[PDB]
């Protein structure tokens, strides 16, 4: 038995098909993550991603913060999660401003594509809504 073969039956391609790369667990898991799911507007792709990241970025600021032992330990850190999201979004704006090119022909049959300038902008704004909202959601969930 052999559990290691060349990816896509191409022996000279520089990839190996192992149970970490292409097994039934990792196939169905990655196919259902928002960066690869079929049937999502690029806003929605960025929303979800942002919804799941802003929620746990909270943790290390509120616990191991410079003002963690104060009566404003929750406030101190929430503000600093927003400042972290502002830096990350800023990296998303500049990346798409330079990687993709503007379109001449109004021709657009795929408005769904993510790897484009128009969709990346929507993907970037969805990340910012979902990450500030999830930062505020566990502000409520921890205030208890």
């Amino acid at each position: 038995a052999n559990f290691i073969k060349p990816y896509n039956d191409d022996p000279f391609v520089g990839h190996l098909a192992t149970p970490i790369t292409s097994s039934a667990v990792t196939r169905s898991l990655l196919k259902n993550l928002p960066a690869y799911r079929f049937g999502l507007t690029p806003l929605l792709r960025g929303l979800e991603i942002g919804l799941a990241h802003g929620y746990f970025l909270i943790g290390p600021f509120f616990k191991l913060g410079p003002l963690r032992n104060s009566e404003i330990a929750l406030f101190a850190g929430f503000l600093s999660t927003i400042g972290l999201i502002l830096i990350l979004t800023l990296g998303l704006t500049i990346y798409g401003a330079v990687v993709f090119k503007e379109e001449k022909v109004m021709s657009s049959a795929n408005v769904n594509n993510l790897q484009t300038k128009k969709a990346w902008d929507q993907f970037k704004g969805g990340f910012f809504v979902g990450a500030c909202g999830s930062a505020g959601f566990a502000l409520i969930c921890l205030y208890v």
């Binding site: 052999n2 190996l16 191991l64 410079p66």
Partner: protein
């Protein structure tokens, strides 16, 4: 029969002809020198036996006889030491009072004011304090007299001449054939049962009959003189039954299978001797007996001339899983037709062993009166850390010499070796990440502590008073070892070491052993250890996996093991050879081992070593500054390096002033290395041309043309001075610091 003796008679004539022709061994150097590079090549290639001949039989004969020459130099070395202990030492005065008399086996001649190095040691004797532990080892053997040391010295000289004769006999007179060398299963049976098994049996025999009863009388308070001759312990059972009253039974409870009669000399008590602070000899006699039975039984696992036993080939070839493909097929041809692949295993094992040896000799001190000699404890520990460090990387060098020269693809289709090479980008990129992950965390813990403390915020540092990082896994294991005597080891009276907890052992007012508590300052340092080993492995592993080719150089194996580069194109090709990977990893081993011995020297001085008074008031050497001073770099720089330097820098006019000179001398050599490591050859060769001109102008020039050191060689010089100067500066700092506190 498959295992036989095959020897060629009168293989090589013994004449002085070749001695007068330097470079006879190789084809290119035998033409003679044209440039000064020839002189350097003469030495770099002298032991490269693989590149001198193409016959595996002729390489194997050269190696075998050279082993005899290496052992003969070791016998000469051992015979010297025993000679110095018999004529230039204070052994007798030390044996009478081994708490006040310091040890010494070297005396210097008075010629340029250097007699000051003869210290006032004690016992009407003046000499240099030696820290090798010869004295303690002699007491454990039951020496007690200089006469006995003289016989060991004569016997060491005779053995040394026997080795010299055997190496000459096996290379010229009786040169054994290739079939003889390729007997792995025979060789394993002989080394396990004969060398290791009979070695432990006979040694145990010396310990039961000679070393055990003499030590009992020394410990009780009998002066050496009143102790009888060792041979008198072999004749009168009356003398032996007074100390161990189970000799009245003789040897009959051994063949009747009643071995518990001998619980007088085969103990399992653990701990240390409250009188000497060393391990119980009675435990050590049991230790060698149980070993020797294990080694002799293990030397029957292979098949030689009688059907029974295992063939090494059918073992390995049976091990193949559905991830490994062919598994271990081919590793026999490898490990029976190539000497490089053998050293790669062997040096990695022997180097790991010397590290393992150093960890077990400070925690369970096996010699008597050695645990309170802190200069010996510190010296012996670091020594094996260095010898272990060099041998480990040396295994990785030969692993890469094997991949370039002896490795063939046709002998290894789809086996474990072939497969590692196939996903070599994955081993290296994943290791690369683990290295960037371990460094940012373990070293960033110290930076955080350095900046937090400097900003006036100690409440936020990683410490035992702030954000704790408790090593809970190692603390958990300590408790298990402490509760082990009685429960898990029901016949053990005490714990193996007192490091895991227990009582405090003291000899002469000094502390021999104490429990070594682990806190967050311990925890942080253990990751530095983790981190520097992972980086060293990253360079050596990469050198072995990419020894034959890369995406950069597809034909690296045709360029060889050690080449300088493949030119200034393809960006920079400098240090692409696998020899240069060995070169870089030598600087890391250095970095890794330096932190290990720094960690050991400081933790023992802060939390173990010290003296005591009434009501058990322990006063440590540096007073317990380890939990709150080693969490920052400034604390390591100011309390370890700056504070403990006071001895070596204030040693002038005293007997330890040689340590002050070697301290400066090694700071000089270390800096001298940086001239070779930062510069390169073509600036030096143009410099030589202007110098040669001044000679040519005066009508003379050497016919051996002067040439700058080559690229590869200029790197090997700078590395040898870097190690010499670096290790040396620490050598002088460690001995002048520990002789003053012992």
């Amino acid at each position: 029969k498959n295992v036989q003796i095959f020897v060629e008679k009168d293989a090589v004539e013994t004449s002085f002809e070749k001695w007068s022709q330097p470079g006879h061994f190789s084809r290119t150097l035998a033409k003679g020198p044209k440039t000064t590079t020839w002189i350097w090549n003469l030495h770099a290639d002298a032991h490269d036996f693989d590149s001198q001949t193409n016959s595996l039989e002729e390489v194997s004969r050269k190696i075998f006889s050279a082993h005899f020459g290496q052992l003969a130099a070791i016998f000469l070395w051992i015979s010297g030491m025993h000679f110095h202990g018999a004529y230039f030492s204070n052994y007798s005065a030390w044996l009478s009072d081994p708490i006040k008399i310091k040890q010494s086996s070297q005396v210097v001649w008075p010629i340029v004011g250097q007699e000051i190095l003869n210290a006032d040691v004690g016992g009407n004797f003046q000499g240099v304090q030696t820290t090798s532990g010869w004295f303690q080892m002699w007491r454990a053997e039951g020496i007690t007299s200089e006469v006995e040391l003289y016989w060991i010295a004569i016997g060491g000289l005779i053995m040394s001449a026997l080795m010299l004769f055997a190496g000459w006999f096996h290379y010229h007179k009786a040169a054994p054939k290739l079939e003889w060398f390729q007997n792995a299963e025979s060789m394993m049976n002989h080394h396990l049962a004969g060398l290791l098994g009979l070695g432990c049996l006979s040694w145990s025999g010396h310990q039961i009959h000679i070393a055990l009863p003499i030590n009992k009388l020394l410990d009780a308070g009998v002066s050496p003189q009143e102790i009888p001759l060792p041979h008198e312990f072999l004749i009168n059972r009356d003398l032996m039954a007074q100390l161990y009253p189970s000799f009245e039974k003789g040897l009959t409870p051994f063949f009747s299978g009643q071995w518990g009669v001998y619980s007088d000399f085969l103990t399992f008590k653990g701990g240390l001797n409250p009188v000497t602070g060393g391990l119980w000899l009675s435990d050590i006699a049991h230790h060698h007996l149980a070993l020797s039975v294990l080694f002799i039984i293990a030397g029957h696992m292979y098949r030689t001339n009688w059907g029974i036993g295992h063939s090494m080939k059918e073992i390995l070839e049976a091990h193949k899983g559905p991830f490994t493909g062919e598994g271990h097929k081919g590793l026999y041809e490898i490990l029976t037709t190539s000497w490089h692949a053998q050293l790669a295993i062997n040096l990695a094992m022997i180097g790991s062993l010397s590290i393992i040896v150093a960890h077990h000799m400070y925690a369970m001190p096996p010699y008597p009166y050695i645990a309170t000699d802190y200069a010996t404890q510190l010296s012996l520990f670091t020594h094996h850390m260095w010898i272990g460090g060099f041998c480990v990387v040396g295994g990785a060098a030969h692993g890469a010499i094997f991949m370039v020269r002896d490795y063939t693809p046709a002998n290894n289709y789809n086996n474990l070796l072939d497969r590692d090479l196939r996903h070599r980008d994955e081993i290296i990129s994943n290791l690369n990440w683990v290295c960037i992950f371990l460094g940012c965390h373990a070293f960033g813990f110290y930076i955080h502590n350095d900046t937090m403390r400097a900003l006036g915020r100690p409440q936020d540092m990683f410490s035992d008073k702030a954000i704790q990082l408790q090593p809970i896994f190692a603390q958990w294991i300590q408790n298990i070892h402490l509760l082990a005597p009685g429960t898990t080891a029901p016949n053990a009276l005490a714990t193996t070491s007192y490091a895991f907890g227990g009582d405090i052992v003291e000899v002469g007012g000094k502390i021999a052993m104490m429990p070594i508590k682990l806190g967050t300052a311990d925890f942080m340092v253990h990751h530095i250890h983790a981190f520097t080993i992972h980086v060293t492995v990253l360079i050596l592993l990469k050198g072995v996996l990419y020894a034959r080719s890369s995406k950069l150089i597809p034909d690296k194996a045709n360029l060889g093991f050690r080449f300088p580069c493949d030119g200034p194109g393809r960006g920079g090709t400098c240090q692409s050879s696998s020899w240069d990977h060995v070169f870089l990893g030598l600087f890391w081993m250095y970095n890794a081992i330096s932190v290990v011995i720094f960690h050991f020297s400081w933790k023992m001085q802060s939390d173990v070593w010290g003296t005591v008074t009434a009501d058990g008031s322990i006063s440590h050497i540096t007073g317990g500054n380890f939990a709150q001073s080693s969490i920052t770099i400034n604390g390591w720089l100011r309390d370890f390096l700056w504070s403990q330097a006071s001895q070596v820098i204030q040693s002038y006019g005293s007997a330890s002033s040689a340590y002050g000179l070697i301290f400066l001398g090694a700071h000089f050599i270390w800096a001298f290395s940086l001239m070779f490591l930062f510069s390169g050859r073509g600036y030096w060769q143009e410099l030589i041309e202007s110098i040669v001109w001044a000679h040519n102008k005066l009508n003379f020039a050497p016919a051996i043309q002067p040439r700058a050191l080559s690229i590869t060689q200029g790197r090997a010089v700078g590395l040898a001075h870097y190690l010499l100067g670096g290790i040396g500066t620490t050598w002088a700092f460690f001995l002048a610091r520990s002789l003053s506190i012992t």
